[PDB]
Motif scaffolding. Structure first.
Motif, PDB file in Angstrom:
ATOM      1  N   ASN A  82     -24.190  55.429  45.543  1.00 23.59           N
ATOM      2  CA  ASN A  82     -24.342  55.947  44.178  1.00 23.59           C
ATOM      3  C   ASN A  82     -24.878  54.905  43.162  1.00 23.59           C
ATOM      4  O   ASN A  82     -24.776  55.112  41.949  1.00 23.59           O
ATOM      5  CB  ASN A  82     -23.053  56.580  43.689  1.00 23.59           C
ATOM      6  CG  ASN A  82     -22.647  57.757  44.528  1.00 23.59           C
ATOM      7  OD1 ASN A  82     -21.621  57.712  45.197  1.00 23.59           O
ATOM      8  ND2 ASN A  82     -23.462  58.825  44.534  1.00 23.59           N
ATOM      9  N   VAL A 138     -30.677  62.551  35.055  1.00 25.39           N
ATOM     10  CA  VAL A 138     -29.645  63.559  34.778  1.00 25.39           C
ATOM     11  C   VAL A 138     -29.974  64.105  33.386  1.00 25.39           C
ATOM     12  O   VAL A 138     -29.688  65.269  33.097  1.00 25.39           O
ATOM     13  CB  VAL A 138     -28.183  63.004  34.913  1.00 25.39           C
ATOM     14  CG1 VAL A 138     -27.162  63.971  34.358  1.00 25.39           C
ATOM     15  CG2 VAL A 138     -27.838  62.686  36.366  1.00 25.39           C
ATOM     16  N   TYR A 176     -20.384  64.939  39.461  1.00 27.59           N
ATOM     17  CA  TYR A 176     -21.093  63.801  38.871  1.00 27.59           C
ATOM     18  C   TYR A 176     -20.084  62.742  38.413  1.00 27.59           C
ATOM     19  O   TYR A 176     -20.298  61.549  38.672  1.00 27.59           O
ATOM     20  CB  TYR A 176     -21.957  64.267  37.693  1.00 27.59           C
ATOM     21  CG  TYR A 176     -23.240  64.993  38.049  1.00 27.59           C
ATOM     22  CD1 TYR A 176     -23.855  64.805  39.285  1.00 27.59           C
ATOM     23  CD2 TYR A 176     -23.920  65.744  37.096  1.00 27.59           C
ATOM     24  CE1 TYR A 176     -25.077  65.409  39.586  1.00 27.59           C
ATOM     25  CE2 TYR A 176     -25.157  66.323  37.374  1.00 27.59           C
ATOM     26  CZ  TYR A 176     -25.721  66.178  38.629  1.00 27.59           C
ATOM     27  OH  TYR A 176     -26.942  66.761  38.891  1.00 27.59           O
ATOM     28  N   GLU A 214     -18.739  60.867  41.491  1.00 29.22           N
ATOM     29  CA  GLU A 214     -19.817  59.978  41.945  1.00 29.22           C
ATOM     30  C   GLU A 214     -19.907  58.709  41.056  1.00 29.22           C
ATOM     31  O   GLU A 214     -19.985  57.601  41.595  1.00 29.22           O
ATOM     32  CB  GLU A 214     -21.164  60.738  42.008  1.00 29.22           C
ATOM     33  CG  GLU A 214     -21.376  61.518  43.302  1.00 29.22           C
ATOM     34  CD  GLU A 214     -22.363  62.676  43.284  1.00 29.22           C
ATOM     35  OE1 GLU A 214     -22.180  63.613  44.094  1.00 29.22           O
ATOM     36  OE2 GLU A 214     -23.322  62.648  42.481  1.00 29.22           O
ATOM     37  N   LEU A 223     -25.944  61.446  42.487  1.00 35.66           N
ATOM     38  CA  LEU A 223     -26.071  60.609  41.300  1.00 35.66           C
ATOM     39  C   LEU A 223     -26.187  59.147  41.718  1.00 35.66           C
ATOM     40  O   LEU A 223     -25.487  58.710  42.640  1.00 35.66           O
ATOM     41  CB  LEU A 223     -24.858  60.829  40.383  1.00 35.66           C
ATOM     42  CG  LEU A 223     -24.871  60.133  39.040  1.00 35.66           C
ATOM     43  CD1 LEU A 223     -24.278  61.017  37.986  1.00 35.66           C
ATOM     44  CD2 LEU A 223     -24.099  58.790  39.098  1.00 35.66           C
TER      45      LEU A 223
END
Ligand SMILES: Nc1ncnc2c1ncn2[C@@H]1O[C@H](COP(=O)(O)OP(=O)(O)O)[C@@H](O)[C@H]1O
Ligand SMILES: O=C(O)c1cc(-c2ccc(Cl)cc2)c2cc[nH]c2c1
Ligand SMILES: O=C(O)[C@@H]1CCCC[C@H]1C(=O)O
Ligand SMILES: [Mg+2]
Ligand SMILES: [Mg+2]
Length: 259
Positions: free
Chosen positions: A67, A93, A111, A114, A145
């Motif tokens: 990540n 994002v 998210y 992550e 992510l």
């Protein structure tokens, strides 16, 4: 290890930077697609940030987490510095949020999980990102992510000095700060993912500064109790009052909606 501009075929720009641009690129021999972050030496010198650039390179090149966006190396010439980055094919994002307006509780919680995992890895090395924001969060091929832009990254503790939207009160005020700044940023993200805009968003830097300092924000009605609880726990003026990342990952709203 030693590269030169002649080793890469340059494609379209991927995005605009504060000190130059990011371009899509392919390494001629291997055909490896990557992103080349191009910075201007004159601009970096004028800003007096030529050492913070060395810090971005040193910190990001030593991080290995699925990540966290990889930085493979760098090279430079008479006018520019080039950072060789992993290409994030599904973009920012930020762009996803612009087209969807808001994310549901499931996408948000995933998210947040992550981010917490990537941040947990960073903080274990005493690394503070300090610039966690939708445009620095990139998406891999599977929509995973990836924390990017280690431009302002430092080792904790630090008393070292775009919008203020994601900066905590201690970082503004130019006071001493640690890993707790990234927990505040996490709460600002969670809010933005669910609401469509950050909680201290304003017309001016002056107004945003005041809102952060006061911790002055409200929730729209559609934000659930569990989401309100997690955000309110993260957005504490006192960094010591902010929870650990382990607590974020074990929060009932996170466990119920992730992943
Ligand atoms: N590896 C990448 N893959 C795809 N797009 C990228 C990548 N790195 C950066 N970008 C795009 O370029 C923009 C600027 O890059 P970034 O490293 O964040 O620059 P800066 O430190 O100037 O803000 C990003 O917000 C994003 O839209
Ligand atoms: O050698 C040089 O001549 C040199 C070098 C750099 C420079 C700084 C950081 C990195 Cl990671 C790589 C190269 C810069 C940055 C602005 N002016 C420079 C000059
Ligand atoms: O990579 C960069 O554009 C910069 C390097 C120097 C510190 C600030 C940083 C940034 O804006 O992220
Ligand atoms: Mg960035
Ligand atoms: Mg940056």
């Amino acid at each position: 290890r030693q590269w030169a501009l002649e080793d890469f075929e340059i494609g379209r720009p991927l995005g605009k930077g504060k000190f130059g641009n990011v371009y899509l690129a392919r390494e001629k021999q291997s055909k490896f697609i990557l992103a080349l972050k191009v910075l201007f030496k004159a601009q970096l010198e004028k800003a007096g940030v030529e050492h913070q650039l060395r810090r971005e390179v040193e910190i990001q090149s030593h991080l290995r987490h699925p990540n966290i966006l990889r930085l493979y190396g760098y090279f430079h010439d008479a006018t520019r510095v080039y950072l060789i980055l992993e290409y994030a094919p599904l973009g920012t994002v930020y762009r996803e949020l612009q087209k969807l307006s808001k994310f549901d509780e499931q996408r948000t919680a995933t998210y947040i999980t992550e981010l917490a995992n990537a941040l947990s890895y960073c903080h274990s090395k005493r690394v503070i990102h300090r610039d966690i924001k939708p445009e620095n969060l990139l998406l891999g091929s599977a929509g995973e992510l990836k924390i990017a832009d280690f431009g302002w990254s430092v080792h904790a503790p630090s008393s070292r000095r775009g919008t203020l939207d994601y900066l905590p009160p201690e970082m503004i005020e130019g006071r001493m700060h640690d890993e707790k700044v990234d927990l505040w940023s996490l709460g600002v993200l969670c809010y933005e993912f669910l609401v469509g805009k950050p909680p201290f968003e304003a017309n001016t830097y002056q107004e945003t500064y005041k809102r952060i300092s006061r911790v002055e924000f409200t929730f729209p009605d559609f934000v659930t109790e569990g989401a309100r609880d997690l955000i309110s726990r993260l957005l504490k003026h006192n960094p010591s009052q902010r929870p650990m990342l382990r607590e974020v990952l074990e929060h009932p709203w996170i466990t119920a909606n992730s992943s």
